[PDB]
Design a protein around this ligand. Structure first.
Ligand SMILES: [Cu+2]
Ligand SMILES: [Cu+2]
Ligand SMILES: [Cu+2]
Ligand SMILES: [Cu+2]
Ligand SMILES: [Cu+2]
Ligand SMILES: [Cu+2]
Ligand SMILES: [Cu+2]
Ligand SMILES: [Cu+2]
Ligand SMILES: [Cu+2]
Ligand SMILES: [Cu+2]
Ligand SMILES: [Cu+2]
Ligand SMILES: [Cu+2]
Ligand SMILES: [Cu+2]
Ligand SMILES: [Cu+2]
Ligand SMILES: [Cu+2]
Lengths: 295, 295, 295
């Protein structure tokens, strides 16, 4: 795209603030940002806030979101679809033109781990170029295993294709499949979808801890066979809904856009790979590490 | 196939009638019928009754089906496999020769949303050419949420490949992936698997309604990540069995041949896309619309 | 690989023995073995014990495994990752060099149907070449339907690609997709992953029996849509955990590495195909048969 040549917009922080007991304001940007998706490989991503996947949003069950999108793309319209909410797609998930803002309001009444993404036609193009992320809605009554969990992280799976190549997007295998982590608490890593960061800087934990992962596979096109090497999932809540309880799963099947909360114990010091067990995708980048130490 | 050149058999209505409290007669045809699968693209489908997917069949739990297949194909044998039933495949799902009929009898003792399809070797060929559909078996005791539902429809996902090209069927990506709807009550739309009909003539509903969809992904080859934009599934019954209850799912993973009953609320007027969230498939046709109005 | 040219190591039996109430010894080999994966097609597989998938291992919930791997490959290191166990991957699933042995110890505390496989980098290469199998961990308290089951078998799904071709493994469609069966009791068949054996020598059962299948899809890359033609699954336990109960499923979605226990009734004499309902994979070999007779 001629108007994107040489464009590399610096990442802008997510803006969020609570404005009442059941209402939150969220402002994001749509922006064009170079990301290093594999060593030596730059992708001029279409992004929320200069991150791909986008920034983590966390709200409470029953929160109404007042969402603003500031579109910094010089020439392409963008939009926002939160899977967490009940909304009219054709009134609430509409396009925001270049250099304009749009504000939209909708309720998040269901707990879980939801995908969000740009909803601009062709949606495959906006997603595949980088406009995806997760919103967590925390359950009013928690999860039944909350008292058991010692540490938590968020992981997101996505794919990368040939740059802005709609033929590749529709008909081709992914070039890369990757994990990222997004921060829940100060000090947590916050990364983009790449083949290397979570290998080189593993997630950290302590021997004997029960770990919770909020996970979502944003696609755009592949399903995920989510597995942590060296353990078994004690508890799995599908889409992060506390009712959809499974126990003792070795691997969790996630559809494209599918989420889960998964919990497992690390019993011994060492490094634990986290994979999709579709090993073609793992080989093309979708392996993260969890380093477990005596401290 | 030389004997199919210029053949376009008019659709024949499904024949069904109840012959006792727990017994139903169903007659279908196998027939060769031109279908417009995308704008300007005709596929000379192998079909049940001149529809692809085939006509909707609905029975009650505990019904014995007395099924007749009249084979109008001039040269290819066909057969019928209902996933709803307990039968001997090698006695009950056998071939019916060109210009002959065969009658078969078997019980449907499990509630759900089942695939049916031709069972003639090579089964991939008969399925991919169009010989697929759904049979719904209604549960004796209903679903626990029956009192909440205001409107219902049936949706079916299937793929189309290069015409009668076994190499493509086994090794290639789908050319099109599509939704159809089949009628449950008078006035409901009844359509074939194409890229456009349910965009141009959306399914209809009223603001505030709880909608039930009976869904099945007949394949032949792809899994489905079933999602309705702008809502969250309140309740999901996997394969349509009332026992397999999930709640608050953003997206439902269906295997090839997999079914579900899903329920959701539309809270605001507008148009709600219904997609598989494998966006390569959505881009190749698998987007339907639900138009929700104040009336 | 020059050092594998002309190498065809005879299969070696699995060695297992119980050494206390909650401790078992298992010795396996890593070895290079020609397998006939389709008629006329030999694959010089990388294997455990000269079988691909490898030998069946069955333990009890709460058993500690003392596992020995003797590496007979003249030049490639191998390792073992059991999904059943809690272990440190970086201490317990490490490489055993050519012509050496390694011993590792870890607990199997969760019941189910687990994948095992070589964990040597690149893991896709070791898996795709044949280093996969299943370990069953029997639940302390059984399954709730145990009293209903008349006969049981184990089935495993895997794929084959172009020989040792990492490009094909990562980016290409499978050449073959296949079932095998592994023996639970004397007289049960024990086969390798091929396109023909379980067609030519079907699994056997008696009219009216409730059949249990322990199943796992080891991949490396595909998901499975597991279906038995002519019946409906009465009960499904996901990953073989008794808590993850589903009922009346026509087809079970298995991720790559995913397992299940499934139970169904065969009501009439005949031959019942067992398929993945991704029919491209079925056409490329993934059809087994169950022959059901009056005796
Ligand atoms: Cu309040
Ligand atoms: Cu506000
Ligand atoms: Cu966009
Ligand atoms: Cu979406
Ligand atoms: Cu703890
Ligand atoms: Cu009666
Ligand atoms: Cu009759
Ligand atoms: Cu046919
Ligand atoms: Cu079938
Ligand atoms: Cu209502
Ligand atoms: Cu004891
Ligand atoms: Cu020992
Ligand atoms: Cu190996
Ligand atoms: Cu593994
Ligand atoms: Cu019995």
């Amino acid at each position: 795209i001629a108007a994107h040549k040489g464009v590399n917009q610096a990442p802008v922080p997510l803006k969020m603030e609570r404005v009442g007991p059941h209402d939150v304001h969220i402002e994001m940007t749509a922006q064009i940002t170079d990301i290093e998706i594999d060593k030596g490989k730059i992708y001029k991503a279409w992004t929320f806030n200069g991150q791909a996947p986008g920034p983590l949003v966390v709200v409470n069950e029953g929160d109404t979101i007042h969402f603003t999108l500031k579109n910094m793309d010089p020439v392409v319209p963008h939009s926002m679809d939160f899977h967490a909410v009940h909304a009219s797609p054709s009134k609430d998930f509409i396009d925001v033109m270049p250099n304009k803002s749009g504000t939209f309001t909708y309720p998040a009444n269901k707990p879980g781990v939801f995908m969000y993404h740009c909803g601009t036609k062709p949606v495959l193009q906006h997603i595949a170029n980088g406009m995806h992320g997760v919103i967590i809605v925390k359950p009013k009554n928690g999860y039944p295993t909350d008292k058991e969990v010692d540490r938590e992280y968020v992981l997101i799976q996505n794919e990368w294709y040939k740059y802005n190549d709609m033929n590749d997007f529709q008909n081709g295998v992914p070039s890369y499949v990757v994990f990222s982590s997004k921060a829940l608490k100060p000090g947590d890593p916050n990364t983009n979808g790449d083949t290397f960061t979570l290998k080189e800087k593993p997630l950290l934990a302590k021997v004997g801890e029960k770990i919770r992962l909020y996970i979502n596979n944003v696609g755009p096109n592949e399903v995920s066979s989510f597995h942590v090497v060296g353990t078994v999932f004690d508890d799995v809540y599908l889409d992060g809904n506390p009712n959809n309880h499974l126990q003792g799963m070795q691997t969790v099947m996630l559809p494209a856009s599918g989420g889960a909360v998964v919990e497992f114990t690390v019993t011994r010091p060492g490094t634990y790979p986290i994979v999709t067990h579709q090993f073609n995708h793992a080989q093309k980048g979708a392996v993260a590490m969890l380093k477990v130490t005596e401290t």
